[PDB]
Symmetry: D2
Subunit: 326 residues, 4 copies
Amino acid sequence: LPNITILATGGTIAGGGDSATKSNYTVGKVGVENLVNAVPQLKDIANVKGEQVVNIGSQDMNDNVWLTLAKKINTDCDKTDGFVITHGVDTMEETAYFLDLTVKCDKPVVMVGAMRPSTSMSADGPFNLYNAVVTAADKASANRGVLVVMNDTVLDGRDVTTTNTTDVATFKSVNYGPLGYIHNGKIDYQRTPARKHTSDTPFDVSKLNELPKVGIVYNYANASDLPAKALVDAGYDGIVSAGVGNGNLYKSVFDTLATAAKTGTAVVRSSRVPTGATTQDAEVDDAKYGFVASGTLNPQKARVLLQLALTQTKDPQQIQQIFNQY
Amino acid sequence: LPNITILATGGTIAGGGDSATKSNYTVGKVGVENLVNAVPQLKDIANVKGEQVVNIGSQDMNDNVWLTLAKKINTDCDKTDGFVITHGVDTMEETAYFLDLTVKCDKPVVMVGAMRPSTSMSADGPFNLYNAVVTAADKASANRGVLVVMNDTVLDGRDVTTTNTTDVATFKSVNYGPLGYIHNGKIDYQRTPARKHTSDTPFDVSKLNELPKVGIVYNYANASDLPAKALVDAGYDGIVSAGVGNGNLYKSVFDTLATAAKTGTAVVRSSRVPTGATTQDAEVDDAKYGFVASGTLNPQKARVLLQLALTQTKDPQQIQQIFNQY
Amino acid sequence: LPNITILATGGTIAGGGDSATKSNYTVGKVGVENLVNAVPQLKDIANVKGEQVVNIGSQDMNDNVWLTLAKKINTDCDKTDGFVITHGVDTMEETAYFLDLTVKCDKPVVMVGAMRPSTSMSADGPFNLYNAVVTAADKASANRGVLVVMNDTVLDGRDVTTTNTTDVATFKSVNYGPLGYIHNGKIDYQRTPARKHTSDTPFDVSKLNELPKVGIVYNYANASDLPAKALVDAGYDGIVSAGVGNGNLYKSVFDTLATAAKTGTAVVRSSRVPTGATTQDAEVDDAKYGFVASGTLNPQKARVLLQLALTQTKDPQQIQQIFNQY
Amino acid sequence: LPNITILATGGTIAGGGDSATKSNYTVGKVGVENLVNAVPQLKDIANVKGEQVVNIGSQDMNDNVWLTLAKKINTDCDKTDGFVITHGVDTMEETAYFLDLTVKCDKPVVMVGAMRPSTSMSADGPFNLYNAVVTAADKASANRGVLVVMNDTVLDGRDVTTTNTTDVATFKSVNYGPLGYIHNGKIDYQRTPARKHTSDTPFDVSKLNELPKVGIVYNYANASDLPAKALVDAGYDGIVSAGVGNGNLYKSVFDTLATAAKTGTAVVRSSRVPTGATTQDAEVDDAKYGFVASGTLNPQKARVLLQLALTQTKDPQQIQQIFNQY
């Protein structure tokens, strides 16, 4: 049986409330050992070893946890046959993509969470964790990049997103679909991400102490330019626009971002719209402003790629190419 | 045949490019009478009269245009049998819900646009317009609140949202579903929104020249508090959070908003997740902080209602009751 | 606290296997009182009484069980405040719509099941049951027709259908959407079905020991007419076609059904396509052939209504009017 | 510019009605030349050559058109750079999969249709045909198997299905998602089907005059065994069950099919449920009855694979392996 390492970071999977029945809960007070022991059947599928890396709600996820995780997986790759990472729902799609772009271990790296706390009736965490271990133990899971496993489904860390605030079935790859479905501890893989990941990216965080500063600004009717100005005034290295429609910007926000780009701020147009690509050759002449189009990357995922692009270049043309390859 | 009035605002529905094939287009050099003449079959179902209210990309939609529209529809209600409003796709969901809450005419008010340019191969606007007029001429459309008609579907103004950046089928009511489908010029209506709309709301905009200042801030891993601080420093009447998962807030953003809410800024927790309610009784003690949970209202929709709630009250308990009724 | 009656029929919700991990299970060796005792929090919200009506896999659901249930609910209406019916997932959508059309009690009648066995890791049945009882105890659930409660969602009996073979989130109202979502033991109802149900239908099953014989035939490339002929040769009261696209029929099948419809068999065109209406005024001249178009009723739902329409009339014009009202 | 062959078979794309506005139409009276000339911009992207193979509604698609198409593509492969096939919506998913399994040309083979007739307002056919030619001309489209292009999306012929009776956006790969999206005449491919197709299958129809007889029977509550018996009595080589839930059978239908399998009839369990796999190791002991589980193949697609399997073997174990590889 394979050796699988659980790197725990907190999340609702490690959350608890005083009633099985009421919706209230807190995260940060349930250790990895407790999660493992709630899933006795993991003995049938792997030699599990748990480590508590941090214990936080993923609403508080940050750069330094990202760097710690990537360096730890790259470092320990040779000590184990696979990794499972327990994590909150809220920012799972961001951490999964960061790791997709920075892990050099091509052994399976699987993230898992739960929508219901560990204390609740019909808690989803136990079976999700089981299925994440299944996935991490499956030799066929290697070289697919970093994965999220939730609700009996294996998802690639680039396209995966949380689609509903409360539903146990929330995680979906909303543009290109899942990689495989898990039934009875077996996976029929029918897909693999073509975008370059892991050891095929140039991004190397092994010596990085920090990541370039990238912020996100939202567009809507009568949108204030104040948030965009505040990132510019603080000297942000990059800004991602959560645009309206096909990545469009309220006029105010456009002006501030156009001026920013001319001073060397990287500006990436994404979209608040939950599916579909932010394309070139629509209403914004990106070449003219030095903007980059995000493709199918949503604002939070565009931030991830932008920060990593900014560790290699500040040239908008080269940042567009990165957005076309990763 | 019914008298139907078309109020044009702009949008892709009367936007054009150099060729039928390519995606590039600018919006707002096509006139209202022009759009009509293109769909001569409109004469089979209504006597249409067209007025150009403004001619903009809806990415530059703003409070003034909203107020202009609400007042026009309300003043002209007794002069026609129904209204169609042509509008850009980008912020159609915002304008529809604003009008849903402020329009006092209970004659049908139908919004319509297009995802493909006038000039494009297989342009969707002609048939969209036709179906929008079908809907506005149907007696069964009255008293259902402000409607959006796209892709053969009749969608209520509160739940309707754009789900894809380029797809002709983008507009969906993603939480509660459509009201009716249109086929062969008839509608089988099987649903109506329970939330109070139009003449069942206390919002009265007839004598307002401006709306309260409400801004939106985005949450994500390592989120800066600088956007939120910029809004508080400007003395914004309200701030909506596009939270992560079930409306949660990055720690720094939470600190800044906790302060805003006890300092004269109403704070509404919404979510960047495209479906489902931001709920009470989850991880955030709304009462302690003076926060309001948005329910199914997405951030830009939550802004609409918060602006209007602030015309009536600054008390977060009363604002929450508004978010529970409209 | 309200008196709620649970009528058990079987299903996966009280089905079990040898282990929590593996997918294998048989259905119907768990008792009704057993299921209750497993969810002790039921006592916080109702006084529940349980009766075992039958104990079957719902794949063997039949006309007798339907009639038994309708009559029981109708006779016992005045003796409880609401009903929960535990049932297999496989034909839950059929039974719910039959009861939707025949139940005369306008107290809440809620159906519930489970996609995972009793014995499985992260079993969905306990919380499903809890939420089903929440829904049946809610006064706001009355007069909305027969309901199905699954995965925190309240779904009307006409539109609800199972969309996936294994997913806990399978049950969706795929054309008109849900009625309400349940969170923290409360329901925010925002929709109600317009189609006539329960006491607004003329279908009265109190004195029937059998239902008219209605069969379903499938269409596909090179479809044999032999199934359709077998039903006509047996003198079936009706045949539903699971047509291709918008209810179309393979040529041979069309010939056999054209004949059936002028020869004492009612013929309803439905569709194998999982969403959308089978319409009039498309490629098939329904009036010429004596055919009925099913609208959004899928084949198995169309059977339900056709059986009940045939208790009242054999005239295809009257049957079509039924399909337009219920 | 590449040479692209259009093989036309009829369909709604070649359909017409007397009004742009009314839903009525017929197919079989609009030739390929007419479709080509409706899309002048095809000159910018390919040297197009059209041939009318047949001119029928796809509700009448059959084995002999399938064999004619596959043999024609295999024969003419060296005379052209790609193929587009114009076809009705109704059975497109069946023809696409057949060709996916029998074409040995690894040059792009793309199917295309339209939901609205060529005569209607906002007819979808012209732009769909444009995008199908784009796809067929893209070198990157080779070795992805046979494709369907509809509504700006490239779909693999195995998973692709029509999901709505009337919506222009109906075609979706409902289990594993699309391969790429088309914008401005360019395709970003992010996926390829892992299931073996085209020159990687053993199926060779070059010398076949006919295909084994396979029928489909539907399951529902109180299902008659008469259709299953009628296929058995006629000596059908195979039967596919459109099962309930995870491919379950009403007891009557089970008995007839169990007995059939013991006499050498091939029996494949599929599901009427529109997404998800019909799995082994659920409620049916397939090994015991000599049944085969269809996986994610829906009944009509299981028929296609079954007919082709039956040209190689009648052994159920070997037919299961075929269902696990193709």
